Amino acid sequence: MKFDPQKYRELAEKDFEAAWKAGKEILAERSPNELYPRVGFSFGKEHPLFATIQRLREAYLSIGFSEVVNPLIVEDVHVKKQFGREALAVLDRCFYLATLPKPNLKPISSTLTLRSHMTTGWFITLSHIADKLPLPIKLFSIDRCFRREQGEDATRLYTYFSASCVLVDEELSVDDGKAVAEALLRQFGFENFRFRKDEKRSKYYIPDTQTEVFAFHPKLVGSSTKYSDGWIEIATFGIYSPTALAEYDIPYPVMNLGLGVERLAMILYGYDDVRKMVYPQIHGEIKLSDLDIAREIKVKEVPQTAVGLKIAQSIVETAEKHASEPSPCSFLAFEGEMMGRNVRVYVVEEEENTKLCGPAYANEVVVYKGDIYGIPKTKKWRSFFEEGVPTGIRYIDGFAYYAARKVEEAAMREQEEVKVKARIVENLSDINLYIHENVRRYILWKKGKIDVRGPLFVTVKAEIE
Amino acid sequence: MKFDPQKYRELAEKDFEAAWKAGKEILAERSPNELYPRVGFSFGKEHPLFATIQRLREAYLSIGFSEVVNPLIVEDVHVKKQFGREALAVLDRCFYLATLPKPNVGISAEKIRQIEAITKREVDSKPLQEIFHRYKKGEIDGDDLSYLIAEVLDVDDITAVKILDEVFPEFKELKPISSTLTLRSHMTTGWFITLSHIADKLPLPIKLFSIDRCFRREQGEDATRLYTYFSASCVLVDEELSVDDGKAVAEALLRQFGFENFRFRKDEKRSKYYIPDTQTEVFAFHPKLVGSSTKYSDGWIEIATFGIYSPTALAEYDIPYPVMNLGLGVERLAMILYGYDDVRKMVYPQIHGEIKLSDLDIAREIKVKEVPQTAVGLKIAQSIVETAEKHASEPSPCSFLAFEGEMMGRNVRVYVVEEEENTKLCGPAYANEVVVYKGDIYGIPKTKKWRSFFEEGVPTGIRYIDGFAYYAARKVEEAAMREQEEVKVKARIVENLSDINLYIHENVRRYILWKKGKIDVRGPLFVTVKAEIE
Amino acid sequence: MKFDPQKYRELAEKDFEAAWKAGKEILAERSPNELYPRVGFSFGKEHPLFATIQRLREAYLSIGFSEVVNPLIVEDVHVKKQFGREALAVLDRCFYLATLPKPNLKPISSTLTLRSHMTTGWFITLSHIADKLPLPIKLFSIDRCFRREQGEDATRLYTYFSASCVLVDEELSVDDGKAVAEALLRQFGFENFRFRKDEKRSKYYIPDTQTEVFAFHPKLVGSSTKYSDGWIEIATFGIYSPTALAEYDIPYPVMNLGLGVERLAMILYGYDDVRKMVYPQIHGEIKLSDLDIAREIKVKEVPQTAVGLKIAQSIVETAEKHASEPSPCSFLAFEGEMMGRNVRVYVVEEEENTKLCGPAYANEVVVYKGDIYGIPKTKKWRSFFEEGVPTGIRYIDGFAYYAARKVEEAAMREQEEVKVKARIVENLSDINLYIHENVRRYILWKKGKIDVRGPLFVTVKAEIE
């Protein structure tokens, strides 16, 4: 609450310590569902694929390449100009575009295709500048490509991102490609590199320049994979063939290096399955932290008056010191007024030979590894309390709040007495607690469990006058 | 090299394979020092501290706080308006700003000055008692290129610097004089000031942050603490606030840095600028810390602290609303994120001897000293290695024509030979390769004995004969200039890189020494090359 | 509200158009203060100084320099080692550190100082590596420095940021410094550069290498300053003198370039005064957009029942079609029930020879240039309505809501009739609208004005039974 500086100013002139202690007066008195962890801030989380793409942009810029957007939709003649004879074979892996013929049904294929690698687009782009800009020209682009690889999914996806670059200069060799790979890859934590000639020898690359790049990453040593030794194939490059360059009037050699983004991201963020990584929602990988679930556990009925609160608070108070006493037995917890009349609240047990409260009255609700537990703070359960996240709500706590608001309803109901007792807890409900239907569906989906049980056996009585 | 597009188009349209194969002509033939890993690209690295700060900026922004710059230099009265009597304990941990006073070329040093022969060094000029009085008025540092360059003649500080020393030992006396100005020991000292100008003129709630420097002495040591540090701080101003707002903020912030669980305890200090019982310490759990050798084996560490400003203190600046303040020590977070155990090594690696090159870096630094300056010379070298590889077992004596051709318009024939008898053309270590492994440079042969090195280190791709061959070719190449006719160069026992025509820049050599690394490049090369140039 | 897919599924199988139109049923019915622009999202805004610092880090990394942290607190002997004789003069501009002597008051100066430029720290840092790392060594650091320049503030501040770098190599010249400046500055939009020898010729730089850099920025041409021609002094560099390098055992020349951050930021974000830029709160530069202020304008009393709303809504409805009718005159606006009994709401005027509503009943509240206006939608005021931000709340709108909640209070009060009328509007209050005390203090501070006036003259009567 807002306060007056003068008061505290002079009030502190008289007695500092008193002024200081007086300060608690400005603090807000929070009710159940407004207490941590039930209250919190949220924020967006980025996706591993796009984070990686952004890291790659930075890395290329770090070594001098300028960004470009290459043609994505292209006439199949371009693949013909680039692969030569081997072109028919290549086009098999591509997708062609088809359009519905404007009915004055059946789509009609055109001669347009989606690029299968960035290269199809690089030649077009280079044709307009390779002879008009100072050398060397260093361009890069991280964008989508489409491929019909076998037409499966267990091995590959239809669309993927290629983090690609081209280097145009008068004198080039396979060494420029090795230098670029190391400089790019070192920025991602790779420490050692090995290169081997790629057996396929594609016709758009000068014979024997097509190289496969292997890099070593410590993060992968001891990995539950064949990448256990730390090495993995991560990119490929080659020097474009004059046969292809010539079909675009490019007169200089061109070093092209391409790296598959999905694989890098998997390594950086620890994924084993590409699809689980880029499409987690679609592949049931949703996930909430224990702290998240704990925040969703709320008190259903809460006292609506400042009086109600201090009542539930008192109910709890006396049960924390007389849950032992033999029954029958009775105690007065609260005495005062609300809504216009005084009231007396009693914590009791009518049954013979037993204790006031059940042995589980002090059990606390705590989340651990996706499960919700109702347990006692015993050495037996320590690990749950220290590594999970306790709600700070006990069995009585949840009940008292219900009790209070219940007499509070009697007061406004014109009654004069109310009976509210609790016996055996079987779920969150029995303890005046709930979670939104979506979180419940979540926990089932994740095959989690809710174990909130126990002998509460606690009764409260009150008489309003 | 460049090529002709039209030519390639027309040859490719008819005979594709021929054109494709011919493409190799446009590639560059690289000399030894132009080959990977000897050539490379570089890039700058980020310092862990500043990296963390930028991430913290992004994290505070993502949760709705706006950036601010708070006062850093402040009168110590603010620590008093904020702590009350406890202030003295605080100020004893702070630094005060002291400054140097101006010297007096009068009164103090003039009654006993004009009572003696002032200056002799002839520069005479009229009494600049004024141009020297203005020094008690308003001056600076570069003002020296004034009362000299445009006074008693003499451009710049040629005689300006020295005229001072041997004429007025008065400047050499000066001693700094403290003031009441202090350097904030935590962001809080400055938040109050900043908040006094807006807590009541901006829409509530007000969410501001600042990640900046603070200063705080500690036992006068470095291994016990640092004099300056960064605090990633924030303030929340609203009508209703409780410790829960501090918790919610700590979690929303820390969760973005990989922490997953939090615990809060009351701070025994119970500092006066905070409402009693609100000063909380925050402990967080981070995976990277579990199983760690550190004192945080279980993954828990105290990462921040927060509280709610005492209305007693808010009043001193006329702030009418409660405010929550959370501070995070940046250095510690950086250590966790980038894996460091010692603050000092983390932020001051260069000064604390923590410099490092990777094996790959060292390999790149191993170059070939002597290299043929001719395209034919390179061919000559290539052929030497070639014939040396073909007839390395031929019993002694023996001889082989390695290369026959023209160089400088003077026919040449180079031979690989072995004079001595009872041995072979090439020594046993002729095919040894130079490889960098765990900081050392080794001259070794590919033997099951050294798999580890060739597999986990970085091969330079250069062998004893390769290095020697380049040396030789350059030699004959030189003779072919001295108008010579017969050249002979030999290699016997190898002691170091030098004996292989290999070298490393002097800084790299020192790095290796400093890191207690070694260079073991030895072995029996015993290879000879003879040339006849006409 | 949550709905059932099956219903809409089959319901759409019967008649799509009907299903579609039925969709409006799931939308939320928003009450006054929950309507745009009264509801919104916020987000953090970064400060120009720190944004610039971050752009500078990127720019240095873009050209190959690695980040470093240099010593900030230093023994004054280092300035002595670096400036030689000219050192006494330099120390005058520095700050020394003093500590309170632990009383078993008066601070005692030590021999420690704060660096006045990054250079004081570079030498220390370079001493440990210039002879142990491959050349060239390219380091940079953007951090704080302290200076007692004249001891004023109208010209300079005590602390500032230096965006600095060093380049260590065997062969260097003043040309390396020019190359670095252009590469760094081009990334900030500067297009042309001129260099002139700095007259001061500091002793830590090789004589005649200390250079001043001038750069041209189009953003500054036509600027209300002498920077009108587009040029401005933006940085300085030089090659460290062997005299100084030698005191640290550094055997190679070193190119050092430093650029003052505050000036760059001012240019990038358009500021004329350094202090107004880095300390806007302290120099009264707080600022809220019109849209922000509009959002803070809320309806004080709002009908608490769905019935109350449709009532206020109806009051408004009939006044929009009978504000003309001559008075005395009366109309029935609503008839139905709430809280347990039927009610009839009347919009009327008892006075003779006049109109039902005042001529200002339809005036709208709109914010423009920091001022709040109550005006009619007339060609005369068009520019205000098209360039400012209207609240969407008119004079009647604000009143009706009050009327409604007022009968709503009579219903629960057991009454049977209520009189609520409005005459002359003099402020936001008279129209059932308010703004939080801090926004009001804001508007006064910014010397803004509130002009909400006019003849409302509208009366409402109702009788609950």
Added chain:
RNA sequence: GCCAGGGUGGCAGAGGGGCUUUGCGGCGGACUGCAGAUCCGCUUUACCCCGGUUCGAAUCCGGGCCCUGGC
């Protein structure tokens, strides 16, 4: 912060009022040697800082730091 043993050259490790180890390492040179060695020459006379004792202290005494077996 309270008990105790101590702080030596690049690394290692003896010793103990002035002369004084030593080993590794390293650097320069020599060697008819076909494998990772041989011989000669080599330092910055090394023992934290402030006082005290003394003709003289690294070695004796007091204090300030720094490492360790301890609460």
